[model samples]
Target: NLIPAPSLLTVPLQPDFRSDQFRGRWYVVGLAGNAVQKKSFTMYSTIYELQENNSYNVTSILVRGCRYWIRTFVPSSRAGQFTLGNMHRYPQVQSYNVQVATTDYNQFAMVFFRKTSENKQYFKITLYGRTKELSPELKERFTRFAKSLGLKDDNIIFSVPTDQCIDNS
Candidate 1:
């Protein structure tokens, strides 16, 4: 289904992705997508744990309130790309195609997320960093990437900084 897609044909991927440095906790600092505009949350974090066969056990924490979810990232044919889905049969989202898009390990990451569900196809973008704060240059790059994907200004969002839902340690 990926190769059959249209717009995704031109999406970029991280060159020589360093999965070693990409692992660990990352803050979800920015977001952009079609459906995401209508939904709002204070903030969230993504923790990537590397698994065998170059897969990942991904977890979502630091939600707005008390929400938690975990999903598996199965390695794709491409270096930085992966297929996202639940560990078991679930009824939320069917599958998601994701790529590292761009990242520099110790600082920031921009991910390209594409979800497919019941007659629905939408793309989600996340710009996360080691910390909640990101450089202004990175913000501009995030905006540009989102816009490049046909996302309007209304869909792009930079979340408010927060210390809640996180452990001080």
Candidate 2:
């Protein structure tokens, strides 16, 4: 199950969040706070490919204390709006939102993802860099953006990439 944020900001989604520009491999540099994620998650990678129907084929792999992977095909109804569902053997969690909060389309990007379950909402604000590492300025940019969303200093947890699992694709 996923959690949605109790309070979210009214930030506008990237007006020109093009699918082609967003396609490629994105390394997770920072993530919003969560118990399950804080316990063990060490790294993550999200690979995006633009489909003919203007949707996206997103293969997201997560690594905790042990390596684990969850692949999902996220469909985009329009720019910056994506839905998660339709994966075989996965939960029918249709009440999820993937919003491209901001991006340079190359160096760094921040995505706001939230899922609702049983009237409770939890969210994850993710920062994606072109490479595994981000510059100090880039990291600060993420922090400022999160702060603009009313996030406390403790709500943001910076992450590091691991070499334990590699995707050579």
Candidate 3:
């Protein structure tokens, strides 16, 4: 069964989130909550490019062995409050909400992602950094924020080193 969206409040999003500043490369260094994600998330990275329509094109690349899994999406709207978008290949997640939990746009960022269907709701927290490594303090802060949202030990996870994966792209 998919985990329901958190009842506890998520961190407030940045009021003036500059899309230009947000556009760039981000390393998915940590992930928490949701059984589906816990099992599937590993060495991954993402690229965001702003579209002329005020929306964004998000490209996610996951590497395992010599395989690369890539998916891209463009938000239905420009607003950061909520966006409904489709995964290029996965239709089950036809609509999902994308909210920026926090970001400096240069170093670190946290995002709240959610999707719901008739019988199930799913939520996950992702930690992104400009580089593969982030400071201990930033990690701790992100972890505490996730915990505040009621994510437990098992659900809270720090991805293993990405050294084992190769980026053929």
lDDT of every predicted structure (CA atoms): 0.79, 0.71, 0.70
Which residue pairs show collisions in model 1?
Answer: none
lDDT, model 2, position 98: 83
Residue pairs clashing, model 2: 3-122, 4-121, 4-122, 4-123, 5-122, 5-123
User: What TM-score, computed on C-alpha atoms, does each candidate reach?
Assistant: 0.87, 0.79, 0.80
Off by more than 4 A, model 3? 1-3, 7-11, 36-41, 65-79, 86-90, 163-169
Tell me the tens digit of each residue's lDDT in model 1 across 1-169: 2122325558888898877789988898899887665444576888899986778888877644655667888888888899875524656567678888889998999988887677578788899999989999999999998877778788888887677664322
Best by lDDT: 1
Residue 155 miss distance in model 3 (angstroms): 0.6
Which runs of model 2 end up more than 4 angstroms from their true locations? 1-9, 33-41, 64-77, 87-94
lDDT of 3 by residue, 9-110 (tens): 444677677878888778888887665334334657777767787676676666544454444444433335456544444556655677787899999999
lDDT leaderboard ranking: 1, 2, 3
The residue-level lDDT of candidate 1 at 23 comes to 95
